[PDB]
Each structure stands twice: as structure tokens, then as C-alpha cells.
Enzyme design. Structure first.
Site, PDB file in Angstrom:
ATOM      1  N   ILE A   1      40.014  40.932  34.062  1.00  0.00           N
ATOM      2  CA  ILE A   1      38.533  40.930  34.001  1.00  0.00           C
ATOM      3  C   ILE A   1      38.077  41.452  32.640  1.00  0.00           C
ATOM      4  CG2 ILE A   1      36.487  42.040  34.896  1.00  0.00           C
ATOM      5  CD1 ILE A   1      37.755  42.405  37.500  1.00  0.00           C
ATOM      6  N   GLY A   2      38.870  42.340  32.026  1.00  0.00           N
ATOM      7  CA  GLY A   2      38.454  43.174  30.880  1.00  0.00           C
ATOM      8  C   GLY A   2      39.644  43.827  30.206  1.00  0.00           C
TER       9      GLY A   2
ATOM     10  N   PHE B   1      41.480  51.798  26.135  1.00  0.00           N
ATOM     11  CA  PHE B   1      41.964  52.543  27.336  1.00  0.00           C
ATOM     12  C   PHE B   1      43.045  51.774  28.101  1.00  0.00           C
ATOM     13  CE2 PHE B   1      38.472  49.858  28.738  1.00  0.00           C
ATOM     14  CZ  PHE B   1      39.021  49.209  29.816  1.00  0.00           C
ATOM     15  N   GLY B   2      43.160  50.465  27.893  1.00  0.00           N
ATOM     16  CA  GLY B   2      44.058  49.610  28.687  1.00  0.00           C
ATOM     17  C   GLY B   2      43.350  48.342  29.114  1.00  0.00           C
ATOM     18  N   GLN B   3      43.379  48.018  30.410  1.00  0.00           N
ATOM     19  CA  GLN B   3      42.747  46.780  30.925  1.00  0.00           C
ATOM     20  C   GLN B   3      42.224  46.972  32.347  1.00  0.00           C
ATOM     21  OE1 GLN B   3      46.016  44.339  29.981  1.00  0.00           O
ATOM     22  NE2 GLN B   3      47.058  44.599  31.961  1.00  0.00           N
TER      23      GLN B   3
ATOM     24  N   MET C   1      33.532  45.615  42.577  1.00  0.00           N
ATOM     25  CA  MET C   1      33.381  44.524  41.598  1.00  0.00           C
ATOM     26  C   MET C   1      31.919  44.469  41.145  1.00  0.00           C
ATOM     27  SD  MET C   1      35.544  42.466  40.283  1.00  0.00           S
ATOM     28  CE  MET C   1      36.653  41.879  41.559  1.00  0.00           C
TER      29      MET C   1
ATOM     30  N   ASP D   1      28.462  56.764  25.187  1.00  0.00           N
ATOM     31  CA  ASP D   1      28.755  55.366  24.759  1.00  0.00           C
ATOM     32  C   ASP D   1      27.875  54.378  25.531  1.00  0.00           C
ATOM     33  OD1 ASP D   1      29.928  53.444  23.114  1.00  0.00           O
ATOM     34  OD2 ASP D   1      31.756  53.226  24.346  1.00  0.00           O
TER      35      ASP D   1
END
Ligand SMILES: Cc1nc2ccc(-c3cc(N)nc(N)c3)nc2n1CCOc1ccccc1
Ligand SMILES: [Cl-]
Ligand SMILES: [Cl-]
EC number: 2.7.11.23
Length: 330
Positions: free
Chosen positions: A17-18, A22-24, A92, A139
Site C-alpha cells: 500500500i505504501g 520506516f519500512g513499508q 484501512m 510532520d
């Protein structure tokens, strides 16, 4: 991470999804709850894990507070460690406010939709300001505000990876550059007020389609801000560790810009009213004759944005008093 994997007899990974520093984030079927969920998988690197543990702590702290304002932030369902990765499970959501601007070909959305976003965003900021929370997002940007549903205008804030409570600050260099408050550019200690600064920048961008202050570097950034809001107050620059990165003090205790090789419009002359097109039919005159875009409507919006872009974070408009603004009166 494969697009058919099974975890802990519970989650079935569907798709990416992204991605992030930081990772995924992956779309996964939760077999227990029998719903799809978003799983934020942190890298097995000490640094991201440590910062993510803080995000989990802050997220779980918010879950312990049942109000009417807690449902504007992505709800953290749970977290666990798997294959040496910290895993955060979320509800989600849909696409982000930047993708919404991309879909207008950067012409911006209506003042009416901007208002709906502002009201949700200010209600979230009010919720983070509850004393026993006192969480600074650090952020806020279009990319970290997600639609709940691609049909609807309900939004939620995500990514508490830079977030810290008041007096748990770690970094001086926080916030996305375009949305970075002056206090954080000037190397000063920051409040929950830096998010109100960011929100102001976002709300303008949502309506005009273009970032309000798109610096290519910290110097460029502060110069583009000074174009619109003029020289910051002396009392602020006098207490600012990095005042002399952008400005210079004079015999009589007054401040000006440090200059380099020529060009910007002089301090305070790039007026927000022209940027917004108050009395010129909205941004690039594109809203001439459209309803809910009366000059009275635009002026209220302009007044509220200048309260969010107060240089002084001690007098900058706090969230409760942003929800009382005439811009939100029907
Ligand atoms: C579709 C969707 N549902 C989500 C639910 C939660 C989260 C989510 C994502 C992140 N970084 N932090 C939290 N606390 C929650 N992200 C969702 N996404 C899209 C994911 O993209 C990203 C990737 C990076 C940054 C922003 C959005
Ligand atoms: Cl952007
Ligand atoms: Cl940050």
C-alpha cells in the site's frame, strides 16, 4: 515480502500500500476480525524500531482517551513483533490529500471542501492538545492526511513516527520543509503550535493547488515566508539560536534579511489575499462566479490562515479558538 504470505495463522498479505524511511505498509486480510487492515512493517534496524516503539506508545496513549475528537487519527488496532520487524496494525484508509490535489491537476479544491478539511484537522489538533496527551505530530503534510473513503470527505491523520509529547523532544530538525514552522527553522524549542503552522500552509495549498512556501533549502524556505509575512518580531529573533542564518541585527536592535546573489518580492509584499485571490475571484481567478466563494467567505478564510501563520507561537491561534472562528459559522 510476498503478495500471498500467511502470518501467525491470522494475517494474509495482499499488496504493498505504501513505502517509507520506516519500512513499508501492506494490505492484509485479518482472518480473526474478517476485515482488511493496513500493517505498518518497521525495518529490523535499531533506529526505526526505537522510533516506532515511541509511535506505538503515543498511539496507545491516545486510545486510552474516549472523547468525540479521538476519531480523527488513524486508530491503531494492535502491534506485534514478527520475523524481527515491529508491526503496527491499522484500519484501512484511502488516498491522501496530495493525491487529491494531483487529481485536480493542482488547481485546488473548493473553499467548502477546504473548510470541511480544516474543521476535522483542527478537531484532531484540539484532541492532541489534551494536557495528559500534549502530542506534537511534527510532520503534518497533505501526504500524512488520508481520506477514510474515496467517495467521502472524512479524513484521518497518520504517521506518528516524528511525534513526541511536550518536553520529550528528540530532534531540532523536525517537520517537512514546506510545512516547517519558523521556530523550528530558527532552531528554537517547539510546541504543539508548530502543527497549527503546518495546518495553515496545508489549507492554503489545498485551495490553490500549490504549496504556500516551497523552499529548496532552509534559507530559501524562510525567504519565501518573509515575502508573505515580513520580518519576524525582534523579541523572537533575539531569543533564536539560528536567527543569524537568515537575518542580521542593527545598531538600534532591528532586524533585516542576510542577502546573497540576486530575487524575491520584498518583505510582506507577496500578500496572501493575492495568493488566495480574495477580491480577484479565487486562485488564478478560476473561482469567479462559483457559489460558497463570496468575498466575505474568502476574507474569513484569510483571517483564520493569518492566525495560523502568527510568527509568535505563544499568540498563534490554538485549536479550540480556531473552531470558534467565523470561517466555521454556517
Ligand atoms: C491505504 C492506507 N491505509 C492506511 C492506514 C494506516 C496507514 C499509516 C501509515 C503510516 N506511515 N503511519 C501510520 N501510523 C499509519 N497508512 C495507510 N494507507 C496508506 C499507507 O501509505 C502511507 C505510507 C507512508 C506514510 C503515509 C501513508
Ligand atoms: Cl507536497
Ligand atoms: Cl520530522
Amino acid at each position: 515480502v510476498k503478495n500471498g504470505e500467511k502470518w501467525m495463522d491470522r494475517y494474509e498479505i495482499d499488496s504493498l500500500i505504501g513505502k517509507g524511511s520506516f519500512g513499508q505498509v501492506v494490505k492484509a486480510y485479518d482472518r480473526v476480525e474478517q476485515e482488511w487492515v493496513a500493517i505498518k512493517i518497521i525495518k529490523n534496524k535499531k533506529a526505526f524500531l526505537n522510533q516506532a516503539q515511541i509511535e506505538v506508545r503515543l498511539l496507545e496513549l491516545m486510545n486510552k482517551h474516549d472523547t468525540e475528537m479521538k476519531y480523527y487519527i488513524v486508530h491503531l488496532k494492535r502491534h506485534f513483533m514478527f520475523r524481527n520487524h515491529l508491526c503496527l496494525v491499522f484500519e484501512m484508509l484511502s488516498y491522501n490529500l496530495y493525491d487529491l490535489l494531483r487529481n485536480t491537476n493542482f488547481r485546488g479544491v473548493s473553499l467548502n471542501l477546504t473548510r470541511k478539511f480544516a474543521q476535522q484537522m483542527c478537531t484532531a489538533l484540539l484532541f492532541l492538545a489534551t494536557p495528559e496527551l500534549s502530542i506534537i505530530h511534527c510532520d503534518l503534510k497533505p501526504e500524512n492526511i488520508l481520506l477514510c473513503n474515496p467517495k467521502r470527505s472524512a479524513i484521518k491523520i497518520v504517521d506518528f513516527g516524528s511525534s513526541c509529547q511536550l518536553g520529550q523532544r528528540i530532534y531540532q530538525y523536525i517537520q517537512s520543509r514546506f510545512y516547517r514552522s519558523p521556530e523550528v527553522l530558527l532552531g528554537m524549542p517547539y510546541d504543539l503550535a508548530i502543527d497549527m503552522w503546518s495546518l495553515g500552509c496545508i489549507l492554503v495549498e489545498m485551495h490553490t493547488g500549490e504549496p504556500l512556501f516551497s523552499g529548496a533549502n532552509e534559507v530559501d524556505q524562510m525567504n519565501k515566508i518573509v515575502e508573505v509575512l515580513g520580518i519576524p518580531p525582534a523579541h523572537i529573533l533575539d531569543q533564536a539560536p539560528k536567527a543569524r542564518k537568515f537575518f542580521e541585527k542593527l545598531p538600534d536592535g532591528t532586524w533585516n534579511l542576510k542577502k546573497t546573489k540576486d530575487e524575491y518580492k520584498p518583505p510582506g509584499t507577496r500578500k496572501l489575499h493575492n495568493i488566495l485571490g480574495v477580491e480577484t475571484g479565487g486562485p488564478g481567478g478560476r473561482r469567479a462566479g462559483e457559489s460558497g466563494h463570496t468575498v466575505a467567505d474568502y476574507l474569513k478564510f484569510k483571517d483564520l490562515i493569518l492566525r495560523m501563520l502568527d510568527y509568535d507561537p505563544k499568540t498563534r491561534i490554538q485549536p479550540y479558538y480556531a473552531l470558534q472562528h467565523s470561517f466555521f459559522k454556517k
